[PDB]
Amino acid sequence: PQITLWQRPLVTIKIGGQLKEALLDTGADDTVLEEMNLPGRWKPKMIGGIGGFIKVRQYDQILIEICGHKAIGTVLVGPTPVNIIGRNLLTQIGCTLNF
Amino acid sequence: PQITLWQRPLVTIKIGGQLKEALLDTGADDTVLEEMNLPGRWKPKMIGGIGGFIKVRQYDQILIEICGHKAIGTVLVGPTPVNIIGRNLLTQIGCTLNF
Numbered sequence A, B: 001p002q003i004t005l006w007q008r009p010l011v012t013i014k015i016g017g018q019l020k021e022a023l024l025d026t027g028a029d030d031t032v033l034e035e036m037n038l039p040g041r042w043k044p045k046m047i048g049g050i051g052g053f054i055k056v057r058q059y060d061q062i063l064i065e066i067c068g069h070k071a072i073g074t075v076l077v078g079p080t081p082v083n084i085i086g087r088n089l090l091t092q093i094g095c096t097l098n099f
């Protein structure tokens, strides 16, 4: 799908048997999503954006059905305003920037 | 251009007689550039990112050449670790997310 940027590139993701909406962020190196009930064993981790640094939990090996397309990777959970599909899954679904 | 997301999508800009590298970012509705000498009246404003809210100075009607493509926009100068080109100019240079 070709998404233009007049409006926030929000997508539909099915993760953890839960449906969520998420920004497609080429600016984040990492996928970070808001608090959500999720299976597994996690690790502490912190990430930084503008303003500061949040303490996330890292879940390695998670399946997301992004835009009705799948990938498996690292989903970090923590204090975000929006769910961010970062570059480590974007490459997996084969997304690119074009101009 | 076709940009794959495997590396961090930095690119060259020319803002105010100066030459810089900027993250092309779909997750920002705004171009926030680090501090530099920009000449003009500026408003304050404040934006949110993952960790907080930065106090930044609005410059409106500034010309940038992002990849050879000039475009006029509003540009925020303030405390960021990276220059970000947001959707307010990404629309303008014709950029499109894709998969």
Ligand SMILES: CC(C)[C@H](NC(=O)OCc1ccccc1)C(=O)N[C@@H](Cc1ccccc1)C(O)[C@H](Cc1ccccc1)NC(=O)[C@@H](NC(=O)OCc1ccccc1)C(C)C
Binding pocket: A025, A026, A027, A028, A029, A030, A032, A047, A048, A049, A050, A081, A082, A084, A086, B023, B025, B026, B027, B028, B029, B030, B032, B046, B047, B048, B049, B050, B081, B082, B084
């Ligand atoms: C650049 C900001 C103006 C932009 N915020 C934004 O557009 O908010 C709207 C707003 C407008 C008016 C009033 C209030 C709010 C933003 O933070 N956008 C995010 C995605 C987002 C959108 C809304 C809220 C929160 C997040 C993302 O682009 C940044 C860019 C960026 C990239 C690299 C470094 C710094 C900034 N990456 C991030 O913040 C990611 N960091 C990242 O991946 O960086 C790696 C790294 C970390 C630390 C040190 C070096 C490198 C996080 C998602 C983890």
